[PDB]
Paper text:
DAC-TP and AZA-TP both contain the same modified nucleobase that closely resembles cytosine, except for the carbon at position 5 of the base that is replaced with a nitrogen atom. The only difference between these two nucleotide analogs is that DAC-TP contains a 2′-deoxyribose sugar, while AZA-TP possesses a ribose sugar with a 2′-hydroxyl group. However, when GTP was added to the mixture, DAC-TP (but not AZA-TP) was hydrolyzed by SAMHD1 just as efficiently as canonical dCTP. The hydrogen-bonding interactions between the SAMHD1 catalytic pocket and DAC-TP are the same as those involved in dCTP binding. In accordance, our current results show that the 2′-deoxyribose nucleotide DAC-TP (but not the ribose nucleotide AZA-TP) binds to both the allosteric A2 and the catalytic site of SAMHD1, being both a substrate and an activator of the enzyme.
The sterile alpha motif and histidine-aspartate domain-containing protein 1 (SAMHD1) is a 2′-deoxynucleoside-5′-triphospohate (dNTP) triphosphohydrolase that cleaves physiological dNTPs (but not ribose-based NTPs) into 2′-deoxynucleosides and inorganic triphosphate. We show that DAC-TP is both an activator and a substrate of SAMHD1.
Author numbering:
A (entry chain B), B (entry chain C), C (entry chain D): 113 to 277, 284 to 599
D (entry chain A): 114 to 277, 284 to 599
Write the structure that this text describes.
Amino acid sequence: DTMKVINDPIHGHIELHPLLVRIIDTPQFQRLRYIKQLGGGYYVFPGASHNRFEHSLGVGYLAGCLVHALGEKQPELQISERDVLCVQIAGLCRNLGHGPFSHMFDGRFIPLARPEVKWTHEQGSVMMFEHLINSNGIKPVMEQYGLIPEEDICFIKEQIVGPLELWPYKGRPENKSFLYEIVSNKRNGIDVDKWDYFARDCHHLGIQNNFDYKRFIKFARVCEVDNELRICARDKEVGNLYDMFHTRNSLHRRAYQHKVGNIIDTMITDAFLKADDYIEITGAGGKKYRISTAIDDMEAYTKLTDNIFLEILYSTDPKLKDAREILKQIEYRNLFKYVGETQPTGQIKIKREDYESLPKEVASAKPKVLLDVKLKAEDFIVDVINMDYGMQEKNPIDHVSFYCKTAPNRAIRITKNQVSQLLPEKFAEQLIRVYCKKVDRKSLYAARQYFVQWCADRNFTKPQDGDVIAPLITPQKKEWN
Amino acid sequence: DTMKVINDPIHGHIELHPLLVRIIDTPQFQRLRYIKQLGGGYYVFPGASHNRFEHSLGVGYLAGCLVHALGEKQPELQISERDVLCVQIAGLCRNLGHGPFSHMFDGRFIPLARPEVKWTHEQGSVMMFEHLINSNGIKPVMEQYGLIPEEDICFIKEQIVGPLELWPYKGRPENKSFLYEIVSNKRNGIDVDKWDYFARDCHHLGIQNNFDYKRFIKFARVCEVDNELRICARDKEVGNLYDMFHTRNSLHRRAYQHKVGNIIDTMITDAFLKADDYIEITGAGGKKYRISTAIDDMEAYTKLTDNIFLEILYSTDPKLKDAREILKQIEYRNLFKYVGETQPTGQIKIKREDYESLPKEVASAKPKVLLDVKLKAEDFIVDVINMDYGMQEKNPIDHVSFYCKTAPNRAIRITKNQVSQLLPEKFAEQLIRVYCKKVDRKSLYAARQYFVQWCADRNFTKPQDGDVIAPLITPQKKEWN
Amino acid sequence: DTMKVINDPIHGHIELHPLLVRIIDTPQFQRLRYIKQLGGGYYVFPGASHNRFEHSLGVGYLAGCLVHALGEKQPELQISERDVLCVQIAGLCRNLGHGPFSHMFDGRFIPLARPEVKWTHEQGSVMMFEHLINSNGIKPVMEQYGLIPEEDICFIKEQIVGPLELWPYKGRPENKSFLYEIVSNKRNGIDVDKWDYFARDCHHLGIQNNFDYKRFIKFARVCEVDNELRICARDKEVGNLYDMFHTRNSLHRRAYQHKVGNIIDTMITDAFLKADDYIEITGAGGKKYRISTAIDDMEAYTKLTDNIFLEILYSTDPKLKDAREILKQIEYRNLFKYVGETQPTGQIKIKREDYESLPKEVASAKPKVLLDVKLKAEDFIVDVINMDYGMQEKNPIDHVSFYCKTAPNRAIRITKNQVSQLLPEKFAEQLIRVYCKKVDRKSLYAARQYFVQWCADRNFTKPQDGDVIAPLITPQKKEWN
Amino acid sequence: TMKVINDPIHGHIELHPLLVRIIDTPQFQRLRYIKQLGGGYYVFPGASHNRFEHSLGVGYLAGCLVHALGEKQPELQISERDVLCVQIAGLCRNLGHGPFSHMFDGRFIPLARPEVKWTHEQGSVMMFEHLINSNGIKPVMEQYGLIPEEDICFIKEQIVGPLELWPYKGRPENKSFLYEIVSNKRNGIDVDKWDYFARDCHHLGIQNNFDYKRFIKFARVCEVDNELRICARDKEVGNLYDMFHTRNSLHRRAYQHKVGNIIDTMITDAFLKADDYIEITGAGGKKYRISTAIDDMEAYTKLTDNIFLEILYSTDPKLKDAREILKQIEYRNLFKYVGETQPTGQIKIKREDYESLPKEVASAKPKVLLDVKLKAEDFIVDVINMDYGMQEKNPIDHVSFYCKTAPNRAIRITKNQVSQLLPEKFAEQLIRVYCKKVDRKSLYAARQYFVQWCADRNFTKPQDGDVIAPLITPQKKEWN
Ligand SMILES: NC1=NCN([C@H]2C[C@H](O)[C@@H](COP(=O)(O)OP(=O)(O)OP(=O)(O)O)O2)C(=O)N1
Ligand SMILES: NC1=NCN([C@H]2C[C@H](O)[C@@H](COP(=O)(O)OP(=O)(O)OP(=O)(O)O)O2)C(=O)N1
Ligand SMILES: NC1=NCN([C@H]2C[C@H](O)[C@@H](COP(=O)(O)OP(=O)(O)OP(=O)(O)O)O2)C(=O)N1
Ligand SMILES: NC1=NCN([C@H]2C[C@H](O)[C@@H](COP(=O)(O)OP(=O)(O)OP(=O)(O)O)O2)C(=O)N1
Ligand SMILES: [Mg+2]
Ligand SMILES: [Mg+2]
Ligand SMILES: [Mg+2]
Ligand SMILES: [Mg+2]
């Protein structure tokens, strides 16, 4: 038996071992062909038609490259063909649990539709994996290639979700600790999933990627850090790591949190809410699930994809009128309208428990201005976006180990002051976007007065356009002028 | 009134006129987001997730580039804003008629489901364009921006499908003849649709593009050729024009006619045929249409997209069983198996009316070999692919006009023997691929012996691997050495 | 007369007006073919073989794109073909005054050869432009295309060096003020020269570019600011402008100030100092000049290119032995050895008058360790590098104007707090690199100890590898751990 | 420890320290001062790249191909030692290039030294010898497990072929396939091409059609006529025809560009007029000329693109003629392109005839009234042989393939098994004519002689023939 070759525009010709092919050629993996990587970003960036499927191949490919690289350079690590496959499998499978429109589903749909449940795509990836394995006769095929399903299935799932329950992992011991850093690096977020999506999202969005993962791979080594074996970067490359998270943040600003992309994701989510009662997805034993409950049964979830959008769009059932009308207004580009953007100030930190209350606050504002129409809470959306370097307030580069040229086996720490003064002083912040559902000229004018008035009242930053959109309101606030 | 900017990975930041934006923001154009450009090719090239929507924006942009370039260099042509917009609209809309999986629908499915009808995506584009214009109050918007609907609608349709019936066109006179060479060039095939898909398909497939469309635009001029003002290429660019069609042929060979890609298209088509009695598509006044009759009402056709594939795959209806199973086999990768490729020799052409007879002819071969199983006509698929330079046996470069540096207004002609001896002798050929529906080790062995024997019997070329797949058959034929 | 097309790998097919062709085809322009853009950088990045010539074509191209784009969108500015040509010429001739190995020459060599005189490549470009025009008969050709020599030459020089002495410019009035911001923007540094070197350097270096100059041009508008017409960016592009300076700093970190690149430049400069007396360059009327004095006569400077490197390398005269040995060490790669890098803490900064004393300070450190050799001051090279966003301590985005979508003719200001808390808190810093001229294991061992001890004594930052290269030294300083 | 180098084409390349010692010599570093495409840079301003970085990439790619063969097929017994000798050959096959690359051994040496037979390959072998001996590389080689007696011979043989029956001494015939990596004499499918396709394209602003990585992935070693050879996958045969189509296309667009070539020619004339006056020092202190530097490697080491500027900046009265030609280049006062034509039917122009062609053009008698009469010396006639690397032969007839169902069995694939759309011929000649007199009247005359001459010889009708010579082309019925 020989390898399958697959051509990918990002990575070129990738070789896939027959076990990986077996996993890929299943309904549970192929499902990822019908889930757009960037959700509603396709409706803003017309090149972003790419799906989770090809992203997963790439992650699997890169996990293999990193593990081979480490193995060829340091044979004393005892990296086995078995470890390589298990890392490739984890990389292939870490995106299995995504739902329709990727981050729209667990980021917006599930939290509103079922506020009580605790669901992430990572948890889904682990459940969908198990389902893939059992439904498809994968265990014997693993054994055929030297894998041991008892330990290795555990290893794979641990790589995706972390500790399943003082070394906390059963899949592998502390001397393979570095394997846990490849696919999903819980310590600092420097992993191959980022490296595929940087290169791949840039290719499709029409933005260029400034981070060189192949250079990182050539400089990476394993060293003993606090009695674990860990992946270490070369000292003088610390600048590139900082830039890696800078790039992540700027891809979030330019594309992933695009103000129209997010409002499209919001309109899609609203339509899913209105359709949730009347759509049925046949699960295991012929049982019936909703869009919001297909997450409890992997056989139903298997069939939950972006197709839901077009089920609703093309439906004739009058119970779906409301859902269908909202999708129709997306097609006509009759979208909820962007009013503006602001941030908090000092150490105001807007908590999740207060998200529901923000539209009422905006409608409660009392601008000293004569207004033709008057707007209510229902007429406002307030979207709160938590921008960070992947570790809330923490600097992930403080959780990175390095080595120097003169003694490559010796791990060292590097602080922000040892690198540059031109680096960020904070590593997290919030943006607040405000939109109005009432879109004629007179409503939009009013929305802008209320909005800027509210920014004034809450001591938020002056919107960039504030003097233009609300010249009677911005003189009131001393901090602004 | 301002231009929308859109960012395209192929062309960068494209500007859209408000009238173009009102056309794009309709159900009839937006449906092109759910039709893959390369149909089944996504299932072989994982980067080829792109859809018809982004290709159409590009054709529209490049149509505008070529018409602006001509207008700037040659003001005497009297090219107006109005002409520019109609060329852009024809370019944006020339792909409106595509069905599910693009060329699969009009090249595999409709010929087999509706043999009696003359259907092309071109004729669909015109029907869909009229439906788009009437359904969305576009005629007053055209008038708002200085177009004259009865004249300009005719012009737009003529650019897409040719004369609607001296000078055969009603929309513009012969002094504007060159404008009909931009979006769909019936004389020699050199047009902006090709240029967009060379660049876009190559970006997504992972095969680099070798044709430079920007260089062609820099050198393009309008000259008088037999009493019409036509587009002329610079003399010493003739070589790049030959390379253009060489590139087109190369992409057909590597990607568009990939042997697995074509058989996935075949399987899907099969699923669609078995499903066609049962799928209802709701059209005008709530009447119901079939997949095969959606082409008869544009309201229904508006809703006929790649969605149909997943409607079938996720159906529970027992009546859709056989269709659903074929699509499920695609997911497991249990595909009909490729047996080999051959071509006709000498004078033999194979006409479209002989296609049905071929699986029978393969089944009737009598290979002199020990064969465990016996295969019937219904076990074989025979795909006949007509490969050419866009004009059957004709050299399209014989239908291009050139100018020289010393007399830029004087059109000339250039023959093949004035360019190079390293150019093709013929400009059309046929490939014949044979596949087997039974996929076991023994049926496949038999399939190979029938196929190679059939090749020998019909005097076709020796398959490349023929001495390996049937070592006992290929000795018999002296022509094969 | 028609346009020359040139194919550039960065911009594609650029059209050049016949006047521009005439300026280009002179010894004074063609000179730039023999001057490497990145100096000694090619000896580290083997892709960086590019010369100032192609970069100059690119700057002129982009200068025309920006002026044409402003003209098309805003006809009310009265941009004439005259203005376009002059801006293009200023763009082409901006780099005429570079010397051998570009920034090496005016950044290292001239300051050490002729400490008293003050020479910049900007003034060199103005003096070389004049000599180009005068020696080649360009004035009459200017007039043949409707330029007015006395106004327009003044305008061209002014766009390069700024005012030649309260509206300070003679070449154009205040109502064309925006034209002074295209080629060399003295207010904030946002200009087309950067845009060309970002794309070009990246293409050659093998590092990818994050900045989209074409997006910036699409969003640019001229608006009234303090009673001046200025170029304004769209408000919500403010983040991209910050990203632009971030990309510049990043290229300086990775490439332009590479530690080995800089030392090669330093070694080359040392060879030129040793050669300076003996190399003769013939200027106006057979007067003889040195490498250091060819900047006084433009006929000599025309003949001063990277060729100097090879004339020294290939020489056999005993007078040049010392120069020739240093260049031979470059070939053998027996370079001065990098010791390490630190930065100053607090807001101490090292003034340019202290730079000479710094090698003596390093030799005067007394690390408490067995050293087999003592090093003297002349064994050390100390390279101090100012990193900023182009305006020393200042935020150049404070000197940029913006407009918003609701009133596109109203200029506004945006402050750093209106953008992001993730931005740099400072805009300038110093790097200090230390190298040793004695390269054997013992001397380098000692240099590391002198070095780290000198960092400790001065309260500079702990070198990243300090614990590894000087473990007997770093324990003394409590703050380091 | 490896050194890492960032190349824009290939990315981060790892160099074994033995490679680094070869590279860090005067003999290898001189390749920094020799442009890959010669006078091409004077037409394509992106093509500033030199032979140095091309050499690195051929070295990297030779390494990639041998490694990949070793990993896929351990039964070939490819050792670390074999990998290093193949990387060195790859690295060193360009060492013998002279100023402006193909200008030097294509134009200047054949005119200045017609007596001698000289190629850049021979020069790469002589330069490699000098590199080794001048820099103490033999003991460094021993230190990494190489054996200089055998391994120097193997490296040389990889560049130049056999140095006089299995013809090779550097390796036995079980390692036959290793001779097919750096410079493949059987069919021209080697890594030198792959690097230049990608590199030249990147700098020229033309996009490359060929996927070398895909080729490496599908490559295998099989036995073919009692010899191990690199074989390709059967279905990749179309890609191989494409590779040669790409090569020809790059020749047409860039390497034989009508002005690039005429700049090479002018530079070549400059070097001919300077040859008596430039002196370059060699071993034992002996002086050599531009034309005789090839006889002494210590002198040849100092002979690079710098000679062009030494001539351009010179003050010596004796160099004035050579200096003026180079100054004509700066001012863009070039010899003028007149046109292009080809022979017809079986006609083939012989290399002994090239000299006489300008006499033929000047001796033509166009029926047109002319102000100027032009002599033989006013014309340059450039004959360019365009092929698929093997004169009239199809290189894909010399490639071995394997199919999926029997990967160890070599097969042959004929052109009719592939496509009817492929070339029927694999070689042709282009004839370009230029005039050294550049005034409008001379150029108009040059055009009438040229088209008359094409008509006399029954060559192809130039493409612009009815426009440039409307009074000459109606005489020829074959043309209309
Ligand atoms: N010339 C060419 N053909 C295919 N191709 C892409 C498609 C796919 O991503 C990858 C492997 O395709 P290939 O056709 O080699 O594989 P297949 O499985 O059909 O053939 P087999 O080896 O089983 O006969 O490359 C590609 O980029 N270029
Ligand atoms: N930083 C960045 N933003 C957007 N963008 C892409 C997306 C889209 O194809 C094109 C225009 O987006 P923009 O955000 O400018 O338009 P929008 O309509 O949302 O803003 P408006 O002008 O209405 O306020 O650019 C892009 O590539 N990079
Ligand atoms: N096929 C091809 N040829 C040239 N070329 C590049 C080189 C050069 O930068 C630009 C213009 O070259 P061209 O050959 O068109 O100009 P030339 O001046 O020799 O021809 P003329 O028009 O005077 O006859 O394009 C290019 O990319 N591809
Ligand atoms: N950030 C960055 N730096 C360098 N670089 C390029 C230059 C060069 O071709 C290759 C290796 O450079 P590096 O700086 O890593 O090596 P050097 O020999 O100086 O460091 P050492 O390891 O000896 O300390 O990469 C690169 O692309 N990006
Ligand atoms: Mg296959
Ligand atoms: Mg908008
Ligand atoms: Mg020309
Ligand atoms: Mg180093």
